[PDB]
Write a protein that binds this DNA or RNA. Sequence first.
RNA 1: AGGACCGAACCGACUAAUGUUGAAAAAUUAGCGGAUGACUUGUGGCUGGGGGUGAAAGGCCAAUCAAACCGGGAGAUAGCU
RNA 2: ACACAGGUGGUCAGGUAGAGAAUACCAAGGCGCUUGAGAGAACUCGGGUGAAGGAACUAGGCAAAAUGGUGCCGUAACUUC
RNA 3: AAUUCCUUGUCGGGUAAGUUCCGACCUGCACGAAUGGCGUAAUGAUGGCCAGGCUGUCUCCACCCGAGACUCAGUGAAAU
RNA 4: CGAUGUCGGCUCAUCACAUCCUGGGGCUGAAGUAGGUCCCAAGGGUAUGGCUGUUCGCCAUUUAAAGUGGUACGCGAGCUGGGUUUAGAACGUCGUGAGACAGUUCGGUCCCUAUCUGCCGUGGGCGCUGGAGAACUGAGGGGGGCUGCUCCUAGUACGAGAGGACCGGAGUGGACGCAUCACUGGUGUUCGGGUUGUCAUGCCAAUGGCACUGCCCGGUAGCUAAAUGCGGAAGAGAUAAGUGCUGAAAGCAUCUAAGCACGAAACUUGCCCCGAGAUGAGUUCUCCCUGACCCUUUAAGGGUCCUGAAGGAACGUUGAAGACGACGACGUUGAUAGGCCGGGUGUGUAAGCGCAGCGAUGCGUUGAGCUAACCGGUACUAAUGAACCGUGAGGCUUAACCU
Lengths: 122, 209, 114, 120, 56
Amino acid sequence: MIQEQTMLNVADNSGARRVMCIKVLGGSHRRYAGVGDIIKITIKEAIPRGKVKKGDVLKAVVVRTKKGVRRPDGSVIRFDGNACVLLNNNSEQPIGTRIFGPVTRELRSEKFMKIISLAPEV
Amino acid sequence: MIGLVGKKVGMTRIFTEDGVSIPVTVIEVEANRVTQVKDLANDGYRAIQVTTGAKKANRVTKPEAGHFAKAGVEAGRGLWEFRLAEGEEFTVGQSISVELFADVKKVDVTGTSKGKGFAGTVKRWNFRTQDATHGNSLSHRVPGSIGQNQTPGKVFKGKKMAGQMGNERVTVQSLDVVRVDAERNLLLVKGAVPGATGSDLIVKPAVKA
Amino acid sequence: SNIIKQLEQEQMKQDVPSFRPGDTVEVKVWVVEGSKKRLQAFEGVVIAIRNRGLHSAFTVRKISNGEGVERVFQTHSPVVDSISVKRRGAVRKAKLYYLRERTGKAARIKERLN
Amino acid sequence: MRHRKSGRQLNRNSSHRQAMFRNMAGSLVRHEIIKTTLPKAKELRRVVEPLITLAKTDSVANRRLAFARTRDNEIVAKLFNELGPRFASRAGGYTRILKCGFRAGDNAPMAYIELVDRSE
Amino acid sequence: AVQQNKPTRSKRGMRRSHDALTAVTSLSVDKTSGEKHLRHHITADGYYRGRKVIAK
RNA sequence: AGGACCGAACCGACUAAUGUUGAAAAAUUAGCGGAUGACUUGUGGCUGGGGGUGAAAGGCCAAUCAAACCGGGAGAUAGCU
RNA sequence: ACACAGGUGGUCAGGUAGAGAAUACCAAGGCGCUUGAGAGAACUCGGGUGAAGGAACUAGGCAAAAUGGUGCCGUAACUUC
RNA sequence: AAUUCCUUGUCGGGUAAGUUCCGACCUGCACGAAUGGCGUAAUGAUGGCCAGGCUGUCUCCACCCGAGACUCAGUGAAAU
RNA sequence: CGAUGUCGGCUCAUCACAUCCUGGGGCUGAAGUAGGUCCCAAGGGUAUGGCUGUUCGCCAUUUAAAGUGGUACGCGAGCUGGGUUUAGAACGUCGUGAGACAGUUCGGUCCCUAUCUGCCGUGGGCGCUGGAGAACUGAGGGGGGCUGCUCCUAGUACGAGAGGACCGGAGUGGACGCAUCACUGGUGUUCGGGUUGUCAUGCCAAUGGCACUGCCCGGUAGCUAAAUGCGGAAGAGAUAAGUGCUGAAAGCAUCUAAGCACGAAACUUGCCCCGAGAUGAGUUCUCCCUGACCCUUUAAGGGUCCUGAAGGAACGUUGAAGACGACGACGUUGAUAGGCCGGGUGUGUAAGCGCAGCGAUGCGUUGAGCUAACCGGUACUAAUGAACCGUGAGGCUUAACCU
């Protein structure tokens, strides 16, 4: 449950450290991002010689949320902190090569397959 | 086809074998027993009137008791009526059980919803609240404007205002029937149906495709 | 609700071990990856238990290679394959939500041993 | 909208209700019959009758537990010394309400609530 | 917020058509004392359902 | 030491909400400024209407102020209603 | 104008905690505010709490939330030092 | 610029995006030297802008506690 | 002009179509994809933010699209009061000056308890022609109609390649609406616990009052949403633009004049709800009432006695019903409410006593004690015998039967 104005952490090593969501893409008056949903972000903080510099505007996929995901048995999985991986803006599949922290079984799709090839858990 | 009259027992869940919880509503459907059959030659329409449950002997009145006595059936807690579907045939006193839904795959459940009393337009019609601060003077949850100006100088019919929400007939359509249990007289449908626990339901087969 | 009480206890698994909050628990969970049905392990401190018969849950908190994770489990789900108690834990409350604010040495639960 | 909630509010806050039933339970234990309003009687049942059942089992923990509720020591003498062994077989229903008209001052539906023995 | 033509006495009585008080409608007779009282209430002498209560 | 600092009494009145046929013809509640000074207060006195007084706003001068109130000229005058 | 939530100078000033005449709870002493009984709708007022987000509200962070004590460490630009 | 019409001047900074804000330029419609010019530490219930924290301000409201509102008894207005 | 409050924001709409999207179609300088342009179409849908008081606009990023207008430039007895446009003050400029400038800047009171219409809900009376209890048909009225993306068909058709379909089907989203509380949560001042100050219960121990519920930590039921189910459809009929078939007037041609077939989210139905005050007051089933006697200005007339049915109403215990009425359940041949019993749930291992310790404390008895609205039972308490209302066979005419 990520919306506009929300500061997310960064899970990959693309260079960003703290980003802000500026749109939730995927529909009209769509309010929330979520489990594996694409957002548009701006970069509010970076490390000094990363691939992405401060104030860039690009896409990301949310990989962890504090709200959490619900499994089909009723079980929830809440994290402690919202996190995203910065995808490339035009043709996706992300920028960074490492992925930190765990991810969830709901990025098990085509594209984000790359993200779960990395990513030490789940 | 016809439906049967149930009773909302409550909600539970049904763990599937592959570990998917299904929220079900349990509907006890006892023997609905036909008290009247209606034909075109006497009524203009083909329909059966069923009863269900049981009523006290001293609480059923003499009109009602004479009706069930003609039908040759025990008095129930109510009378309902189902329109027939052109090739169906029932007799008076015939009992109908939950076994009828052993093929149906998806039903529509009709009950009276829970009465929420005099509700304001934020609960009732999902109006959006005005500012909670920034100057606002005694008008936080109020409906705003209700119409235009000299032209029309009237509030139109069916303007959304506040009043009684709840406690009315609602039908939920296309619910997946999870189990039919002829032993315990139960019907487990997937989802929530209208009404508080113990409320009378009417479960028909789904008319949608 | 003898109908619902009779109907739920037909689904309750029988061998659920006795645990209480504060306990380190390994929970083995069926994870399905396409055709292969794997069984993975989630070990952490029980921070919360809801007892409602069939609708009994319990929340397990792990600090997974980075940040912290809370899985709430439905106890009587067929997904939840095994529960085993690793380290019995001595706390005073019933819901240990204060541990959401503590890491490392502050989030340290004494052992119960009785 | 209230659905299944129990407990009259009685146009008081929670601490004034709590205090008021503590006094009024004390008065019904003391005098064995009091005249109150009909709603205050009907709530006084749910406060008073648990003190009688607590009194049916005499121990130091129940004397102190019925002195936390009720806060009077004569009252927890009559409970545990007189009323508890008086009922002792009566399973609930320690008190009856008898409707008795209306006040003059504000036309309130009064009622005499009394203990169910008063064989004296 | 205020009227614009004085309402009539017609409309006034029409509004008061419902302000009528209902009678008691019949009050019941005690079993022992044989005196009258509201139903489900005690009598003026303090009986109820033929037994003596209060006695003040 | 200090037209010093924080802060009650004390003096004030910055914001908001209520109130606006008020509890009140200017307040209440929650915060707010000064608080040994060009402070504040009691009792008495003095200044008066084109006059007073004014750290000046045309403010204040008995709920009245770009000229008080009362009485009189006076039934002013009103090509206006 | 009221048996009016306002205004009105001086004097006395106990306990515990506290720097304190603040504040909390109390003593001496005085009161329960001259309409009550119910119910527990919308809506209004005064408040409590709130998932995830955290100014996106808005004329404007208005309002609310937050900060808040004592001791010790430590403390920049600029400066009339 | 409390001064600038044209004007949201142009360039730069801050912002994902800045008619406001800061720095600069100077084509000052219509600054300017005790109706003072320009600086200025401290001060301000002063005006404008930014940030950290914080939050029901808001996304989007939900529930609860009280006082009215509603019903009963008594008294019993007002503008129009 | 004995007052019709004037920008903008909010809340809440509503209509038009000169249509932004979705739907149908003709021409194309239409290969496909994407377009351009024109006809038809008003079902539903039709952004969030930076700046600014701004509408507008520019910008950022979305979207199927971010329509154009009317409605006192809709909406201040609905909110705001930022702008304009009172009284204070200053700048630039004008005037000798008082002052002045839709030039600028800072500060600056927005009342109303609704009588009538309207509207949203909700009842009482009477009618419907004997009374009453139910179930209905349905005249009519309202709600709902949005849509993306992915996959298959198919990398086929088309194209030199790049690229890339129509028609048809499956899945899964967004926004919206209905329901619900099983799950995840919120609340939960009525449950349990921790703890600060102080006061009291004689005192220790234990408790209680007050301090915003004193501050907190959890939490039952209920209510709830961020939670979870479901929905918008298929189909039919009559069509719009459009496309035709046969076919003359006009021995050809021609979709039209006779005749015939297609044809869209619009229209009528299909789906959901209200609904016989539908005064055109309908239908069906069932239940109850089968006495005498006077008077007259002899009428569907009035009165007296005897009867009082079916049923309703009142009263009481009340409810996941409720502002109040209303609606639902129960009233002793009875689980309607309270209590009680058992369970569950929540909190988290009470008090007393014993042991260890100098002591704070810790350990044992002990997952203990206490547990609200929950669940299953139980007549212990309260739901009283009765009284009250409602009657006594239901008009006239005509017709068809009285087998």
